[PDB]
Amino acid sequence: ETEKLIRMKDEELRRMQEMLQRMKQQMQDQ
Amino acid sequence: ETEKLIRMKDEELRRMQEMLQRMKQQMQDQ
Known part of the structure; x- marks a missing residue:
C-alpha cells in the first residue's frame, strides 16, 4: 500500500x- | 517517513x- 502509493x-x-x-x-509554436 | 512523502x-x-x-x-488566449 504505502510504498505502492508513493510509486x-x-x-x-x-x-x-x-x-x-x-x-x-506547443505554446512556443505561436 | 512515508506519510510525509505522500503529502x-x-x-x-x-x-x-x-x-x-x-x-x-494561456493557450486559449491564442
Whole structure:
C-alpha cells in the first residue's frame, strides 16, 4: 500500500511534467 | 517517513495541475 502509493504518485508526477513539456512546446509554436 | 512523502507528492501534484490549467488558459488566449 504505502510504498505502492508513493510509486503511483511518482508515475503521475512524471506524466504531468511530460504533459507540461508538451504544452510548453506547443505554446512556443505561436 | 512515508506519510510525509505522500503529502509532499500530493502537494506537487496539486501545483502541477494548477500550472497545467494555467497554461491551458494561456493557450486559449491564442
